[PDB]
Amino acid sequence: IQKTPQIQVYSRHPPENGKPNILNCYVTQFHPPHIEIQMLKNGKKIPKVEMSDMSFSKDWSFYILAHTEFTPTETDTYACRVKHDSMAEPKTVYWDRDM
Amino acid sequence: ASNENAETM
Amino acid sequence: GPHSMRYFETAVSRPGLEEPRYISVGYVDNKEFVRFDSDAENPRYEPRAPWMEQEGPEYWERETQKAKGQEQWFRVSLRNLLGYYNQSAGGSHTLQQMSGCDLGSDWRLLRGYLQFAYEGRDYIALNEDLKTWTAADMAAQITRRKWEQSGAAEHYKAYLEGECVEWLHRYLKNGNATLLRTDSPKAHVTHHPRSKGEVTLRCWALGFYPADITLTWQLNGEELTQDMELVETRPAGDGTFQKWASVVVPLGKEQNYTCRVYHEGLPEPLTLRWE
Numbered sequence A: 001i002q003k004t005p006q007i008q009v010y011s012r013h014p015p016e017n018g019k020p021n022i023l024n025c026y027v028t029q030f031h032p033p034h035i036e037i038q039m040l041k042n043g044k045k046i047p048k049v050e051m052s053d054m055s056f057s058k059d060w061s062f063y064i065l066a067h068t069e070f071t072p073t074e075t076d077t078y079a080c081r082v083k084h085d086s087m088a089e090p091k092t093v094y095w096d097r098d099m
Numbered sequence B: 001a002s003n004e005n006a007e008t009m
Numbered sequence C: 001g002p003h004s005m006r007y008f009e010t011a012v013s014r015p016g017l018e019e020p021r022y023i024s025v026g027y028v029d030n031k032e033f034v035r036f037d038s039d040a041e042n043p044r045y046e047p048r049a050p051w052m053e054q055e056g057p058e059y060w061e062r063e064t065q066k067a068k069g070q071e072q073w074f075r076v077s078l079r080n081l082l083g084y085y086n087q088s089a090g091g092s093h094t095l096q097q098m099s100g101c102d103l104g105s106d107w108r109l110l111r112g113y114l115q116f117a118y119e120g121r122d123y124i125a126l127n128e129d130l131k132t133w134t135a136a137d138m139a140a141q142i143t144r145r146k147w148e149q150s151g152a153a154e155h156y157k158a159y160l161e162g163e164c165v166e167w168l169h170r171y172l173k174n175g176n177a178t179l180l181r182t183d184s185p186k187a188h189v190t191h192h193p194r195s196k197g198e199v200t201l202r203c204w205a206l207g208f209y210p211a212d213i214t215l216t217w218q219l220n221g222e223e224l225t226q227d228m229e230l231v232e233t234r235p236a237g238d239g240t241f242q243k244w245a246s247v248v249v250p251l252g253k254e255q256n257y258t259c260r261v262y263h264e265g266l267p268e269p270l271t272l273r274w275e
Helices: C057-084 C138-150 C152-161 C163-174 C176-180
Strands: A006-011 A021-030 A036-041 A062-070 A078-083 A091-094 C003-012 C021-028 C031-037 C094-103 C109-118 C121-126 C133-135 C186-195 C198-208 C214-218 C241-250 C258-262 C270-272
Touching: A006 A078, A006 A091, A021 A036, A021 A078, A036 A062, C003 C057, C003 C163, C021 C057, C021 C163, C031 C057, C057 C094, C057 C138, C094 C152, C094 C163, C109 C152, C121 C138, C133 C138, C138 C152, C152 C163, C163 C176, C186 C258, C186 C270, C198 C214, C198 C258, C214 C241
Parallel strands: none
Antiparallel strands: A006 A021, A021 A062, A036 A078, A078 A091, C003 C021, C003 C094, C021 C031, C094 C109, C109 C121, C121 C133, C186 C198, C198 C241, C214 C258, C258 C270
């Protein structure tokens, strides 16, 4: 009935401080399809976060890609926060430029 | 082209 | 060698909301090429690969007419399952469908598919003979029996062996070269500090298509393969994919390691190491 979102957070291109880029929050293996995905810049919700249309894979589970324009720096932090029926609390995944 | 189902469940 | 067409359809209950959300998405060789969505302002099937832009207005209307039908089919089945499962209204429920045909190496139907899922669990499937069903559980019986008694399978059989087969040929003709396309990975290795004399060398594959790939770390007679850190393949969001492989390593002794990259795109396998 319920499956737990896997989350990946990563830049579209290898990051360079100063260089505009797209940051991805990629969420997979969930059910039901209702999900809310936030993306954060230093503990502030980022508005204008784009969502893809929803798809499911051959195991019936859904996946989706949310993304937003970002410009890396030394000091800013980015994270993806996912809220889902299959989880008591929203799961937050930090972005690590090395990963 | 898509299919239209027959009998409902 | 093979090729396939498939349609993925979902219907979701909406509490009170006299109508549920319905989505249909078509795939040719795992590539998305059409999509229909209830929630659209003016919902209809909509091209989603370049090569579907030919099909004139006759096609989109017919395919749209079909979704209208599926919507109701799912509105009703969705309601019938409520009963089978003793679920009340005012709840969220999901019905999913996977259907379509596989063409073999010698361009003949290799098999057909029609699977159903309720609340994310297998419910009912047409077996390979396209005459008989596998039901997932007790409740699925009520549908298996009803469908057996209606000989509902005969109808899917006809689609799977007829129309499905002929349209796949049609699209494969319009999108042949586009589908075979490769984007070759672009690789590089990074160096990250870890702890007392260990280091991380991770090997990036970027910008490639399709997702399928293989990343390998070697010293020489390439050993370990327990400790390699891996990430699932991820969409860059631009059409391309990404992936990386990392290993933890003694310092100084840095360059005895070698990442290797393997992908349909490549004129030849990739070979690289740190620096």
